[PDB]
């Protein structure tokens, strides 16, 4: 028995190692990221998380990138500069995957990209999964 | 509030427009495909579905690709060649996605690649979404 | 040691206790022995040539 999961839980590419694609989370009420590495890394690779606002000239085109603000939890540390980031540790192996998501939505489009385009940044793939279509 | 959907429904890249990556599905009991196009197409693009099995030399590395066979339904007609195929229509709109799945599993790895590599097959992106874990 | 270079050493083997205890003259009657606890512990921890 198999199901057409893509009907209920579609997924979209977010990072290929050479470019980043904005993902429209507007119609879906929940989402999360997923990471995987296709080769051994040389050091941790930090990723910046952005979001876009609807452009003026068109209601379905993303605007310029806006950096997502941090959100401290019930108690604990806060990011040094008050922003959100994710760091992929060096100990990660090729045959494993990592999952994570931000606590809040903000704009209707979301995106993610590395801090610097180095040789290691090309070894990481990022995919976005959405759940519970609302429209 | 949004959840960490990446923990229960991880997804992986299959075809990013230049390369095809084998996806290991044995750890999950359901899966499906999602097709998105990032601009207008010029003609129909057909895709072949493959599956692999553990290589003789190493039990965690895939062997050469084998092509998935077709299976007909109750009130239906088998395809002429007896092999599974997926074709994306020319009239597909950029701002929508289509999801389809295969009825059977076969080997523990699955893959997908266009029948012909050209300037049109590079406009499509395919991502595989799993469901349920058993390890 | 070896016959070419003998090495005389004081010793106390299992059979010495047996000989000593059994050599008591029979006429004098039943006897009782007195000894230190470590001596009995040493006696009870003997092993033959094979380690048993």
């Amino acid at each position: 028995m198999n199901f057409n999961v893509g009907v209920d839980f579609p997924s979209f590419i977010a990072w290929d190692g050479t470019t980043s694609f904005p993902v429209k989370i507007d119609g879906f009420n929940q989402f999360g990221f997923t990471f995987k590495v296709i080769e051994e890394l040389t050091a941790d690779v930090p990723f910046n998380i952005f979001y876009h606002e609807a452009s003026e000239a068109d209601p379905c085109v993303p605007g310029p990138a806006i950096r997502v603000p941090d959100v401290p939890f019930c108690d604990g540390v806060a990011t040094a500069d008050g922003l959100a980031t994710v760091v992929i540790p060096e100990a990660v192996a090729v045959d494993s995957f990592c999952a994570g998501s931000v606590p809040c939505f903000n704009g209707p489009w979301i995106s993610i990209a590395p801090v610097t385009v180095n040789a290691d940044s090309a070894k990481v793939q990022v995919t976005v999964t959405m759940k519970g279509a609302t429209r | 509030m949004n959840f960490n959907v990446g923990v229960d429904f991880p997804s992986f890249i299959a075809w990013d427009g230049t390369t095809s990556f084998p996806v290991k599905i044995d750890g999950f009991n359901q899966f499906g495909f999602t097709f998105k196009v990032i601009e207008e197409l010029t003609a129909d693009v057909p895709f072949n579905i493959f599956y692999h099995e553990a290589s003789e030399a190493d039990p965690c590395v895939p062997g050469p690709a084998i092509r998935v066979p077709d299976v007909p339904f109750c009130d239906g007609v088998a395809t002429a060649d007896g092999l599974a195929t997926v074709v994306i229509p020319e009239a597909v709109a950029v701002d929508s996605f289509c999801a389809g799945s295969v009825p059977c599993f076969n080997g523990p790895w699955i893959s997908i690649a266009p029948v012909t590599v050209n300037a049109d097959s590079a406009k499509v992106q395919v991502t595989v979404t799993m469901k349920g874990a058993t390890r | 040691g070896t016959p070419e270079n003998p090495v005389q050493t004081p010793a106390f083997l299992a059979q010495d206790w047996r000989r000593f205890v059994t050599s008591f003259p029979a006429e004098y009657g039943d006897a009782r022995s007195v000894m230190h606890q470590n001596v009995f512990g040493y006696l009870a921890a003997m092993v033959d040539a094979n380690g048993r």
Partner: peptide, 27 residues
């Protein structure tokens, strides 16, 4: 900063030797 969740896709059981006492040799 977000906390990730990690899980492996493959497994390889640890293979450790077991050692046993050597044969008796007089001290």
């Amino acid at each position: 900063m977000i906390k990730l969740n990690c899980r492996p896709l493959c497994q390889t059981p640890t293979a450790s030797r077991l050692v046993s006492p050597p044969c008796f040799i007089c001290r």
